[PDB]
Enzyme design. Structure first.
Site, PDB file in Angstrom:
ATOM      1  N   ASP A  25      36.746  42.105  33.914  1.00  0.00           N
ATOM      2  CA  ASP A  25      36.247  43.208  34.736  1.00  0.00           C
ATOM      3  C   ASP A  25      35.884  44.443  33.952  1.00  0.00           C
ATOM      4  O   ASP A  25      36.742  45.265  33.653  1.00  0.00           O
ATOM      5  CB  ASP A  25      37.324  43.558  35.748  1.00  0.00           C
ATOM      6  CG  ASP A  25      36.867  44.492  36.855  1.00  0.00           C
ATOM      7  OD1 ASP A  25      35.741  45.057  36.700  1.00  0.00           O
ATOM      8  OD2 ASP A  25      37.638  44.647  37.845  1.00  0.00           O
ATOM      9  N   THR A  26      34.601  44.596  33.640  1.00  0.00           N
ATOM     10  CA  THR A  26      34.188  45.738  32.848  1.00  0.00           C
ATOM     11  C   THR A  26      34.317  47.057  33.596  1.00  0.00           C
ATOM     12  O   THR A  26      34.339  48.117  32.962  1.00  0.00           O
ATOM     13  CB  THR A  26      32.740  45.569  32.361  1.00  0.00           C
ATOM     14  OG1 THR A  26      31.852  45.377  33.447  1.00  0.00           O
ATOM     15  CG2 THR A  26      32.680  44.340  31.455  1.00  0.00           C
ATOM     16  N   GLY A  27      34.438  46.987  34.920  1.00  0.00           N
ATOM     17  CA  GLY A  27      34.631  48.196  35.690  1.00  0.00           C
ATOM     18  C   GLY A  27      36.062  48.637  35.835  1.00  0.00           C
ATOM     19  O   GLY A  27      36.315  49.639  36.491  1.00  0.00           O
TER      20      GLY A  27
HETATM   21  C1  LIG Z   1      38.886  45.119  42.069  1.00  0.00           C
HETATM   22  C2  LIG Z   1      37.632  44.269  41.789  1.00  0.00           C
HETATM   23  C3  LIG Z   1      37.951  42.809  42.136  1.00  0.00           C
HETATM   24  C4  LIG Z   1      36.415  44.786  42.581  1.00  0.00           C
HETATM   25  N1  LIG Z   1      36.107  46.180  42.361  1.00  0.00           N
HETATM   26  C5  LIG Z   1      35.382  46.406  41.132  1.00  0.00           C
HETATM   27  C6  LIG Z   1      36.264  46.982  40.026  1.00  0.00           C
HETATM   28  O1  LIG Z   1      35.627  46.875  38.750  1.00  0.00           O
HETATM   29  C7  LIG Z   1      36.694  48.420  40.257  1.00  0.00           C
HETATM   30  C8  LIG Z   1      35.503  49.398  40.223  1.00  0.00           C
HETATM   31  C9  LIG Z   1      35.902  50.854  40.394  1.00  0.00           C
HETATM   32  C10 LIG Z   1      36.147  51.717  39.326  1.00  0.00           C
HETATM   33  C11 LIG Z   1      36.525  53.033  39.586  1.00  0.00           C
HETATM   34  C12 LIG Z   1      36.837  53.429  40.865  1.00  0.00           C
HETATM   35  C13 LIG Z   1      36.581  52.636  41.958  1.00  0.00           C
HETATM   36  C14 LIG Z   1      36.143  51.349  41.672  1.00  0.00           C
HETATM   37  N2  LIG Z   1      37.667  48.821  39.223  1.00  0.00           N
HETATM   38  C15 LIG Z   1      38.951  49.085  39.489  1.00  0.00           C
HETATM   39  O2  LIG Z   1      39.481  49.008  40.605  1.00  0.00           O
HETATM   40  O3  LIG Z   1      39.643  49.482  38.404  1.00  0.00           O
HETATM   41  C16 LIG Z   1      41.076  49.591  38.589  1.00  0.00           C
HETATM   42  C17 LIG Z   1      41.783  48.252  38.444  1.00  0.00           C
HETATM   43  C18 LIG Z   1      42.525  48.350  37.096  1.00  0.00           C
HETATM   44  O4  LIG Z   1      41.809  49.384  36.385  1.00  0.00           O
HETATM   45  C19 LIG Z   1      41.604  50.388  37.390  1.00  0.00           C
HETATM   46  S1  LIG Z   1      35.676  47.041  43.700  1.00  0.00           S
HETATM   47  O5  LIG Z   1      35.326  48.421  43.249  1.00  0.00           O
HETATM   48  O6  LIG Z   1      36.877  47.054  44.609  1.00  0.00           O
HETATM   49  C20 LIG Z   1      34.287  46.355  44.509  1.00  0.00           C
HETATM   50  C21 LIG Z   1      34.420  45.324  45.425  1.00  0.00           C
HETATM   51  C22 LIG Z   1      33.322  44.717  46.013  1.00  0.00           C
HETATM   52  C23 LIG Z   1      32.022  45.043  45.622  1.00  0.00           C
HETATM   53  N3  LIG Z   1      30.974  44.415  46.153  1.00  0.00           N
HETATM   54  C24 LIG Z   1      31.870  46.024  44.655  1.00  0.00           C
HETATM   55  C25 LIG Z   1      32.993  46.638  44.103  1.00  0.00           C
END
Ligand SMILES: CC(C)CN(C[C@@H](O)[C@H](Cc1ccccc1)NC(=O)O[C@H]1CCOC1)S(=O)(=O)c1ccc(N)cc1
Ligand SMILES: [Cl-]
Ligand SMILES: [Cl-]
Ligand SMILES: [Cl-]
Ligand SMILES: [Cl-]
Ligand SMILES: [Cl-]
Ligand SMILES: [Cl-]
Ligand SMILES: [Cl-]
Ligand code: NA
Ligand code: NA
Ligand code: NA
Lengths: 99, 99
Positions: A25-27
């Site tokens: 997960d790059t995000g």
């Molecule tokens: C949790 C994953 C499985 C899915 N997410 C993507 C992730 O990359 C998510 C992106 C993000 C970064 C910063 C703030 C808010 C969100 N990062 C994340 O939570 O970082 C946390 C977990 C540890 O480090 C910190 S999502 O945002 O819920 C999502 C869901 C569905 C769609 N269609 C698009 C996005």
């Protein structure tokens, strides 16, 4: 490997002698995994996602294998929807995004 | 380009005439952008992650320019804390994770 993104980028990880599935997960700044036992002390951490911020347990210097690559670093444990390998360990295994 | 993961992989996007910063997120199934107007039909959706779920509007067949590369696909709009380019559009610009 070179992993395309038509499907979720799920790999096998090994932690605590146990195989689990996790998402690359790059995000995610941080690696967070579902409830399990890890050794040592933990510290509190808040992490923010799409629905808001939640409390997790932070364990430092944990041995973990990711798709066959070894890493040693911080693993958060808490109520995550899936096991997530974030940038703190993606960098250790030398992952990059390319297009 | 090759993007390392030492910091968040943020790029400039153009959507609906607007320039925005967005995260290239291999952990996101679909693209979700902060509140904005888009043309055409939409339907409601819930998406979930760390912290729970948010309600978004789903717009189909939307063109985005991502770091200079045009794609078309579904764009979700709603109260996301960060603009996210997910797999549905990362595939179209040929993005891969490499290690
Ligand atoms: C949790 C994953 C499985 C899915 N997410 C993507 C992730 O990359 C998510 C992106 C993000 C970064 C910063 C703030 C808010 C969100 N990062 C994340 O939570 O970082 C946390 C977990 C540890 O480090 C910190 S999502 O945002 O819920 C999502 C869901 C569905 C769609 N269609 C698009 C996005
Ligand atoms: Cl598992
Ligand atoms: Cl356990
Ligand atoms: Cl694997
Ligand atoms: Cl770390
Ligand atoms: Cl909501
Ligand atoms: Cl799509
Ligand atoms: Cl391809
Ligand atoms: Na424990
Ligand atoms: Na420790
Ligand atoms: Na449309």
């Amino acid at each position: 490997p070179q992993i395309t993104l038509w499907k979720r980028p799920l790999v096998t990880i090994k932690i605590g002698g146990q195989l689990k599935e996790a998402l690359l997960d790059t995000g995610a700044d941080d690696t967070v995994i579902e409830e399990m036992s890890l050794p040592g002390r933990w510290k509190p951490k808040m992490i923010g996602g799409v629905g808001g911020f939640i409390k997790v347990r932070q364990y430092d210097q944990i041995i973990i294998e990711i798709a066959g690559h070894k890493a040693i670093g911080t693993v958060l444990v808490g109520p995550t929807p899936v096991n997530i390998i974030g940038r703190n360990l993606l960098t250790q295994i030398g992952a990059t995004l390319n297009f």
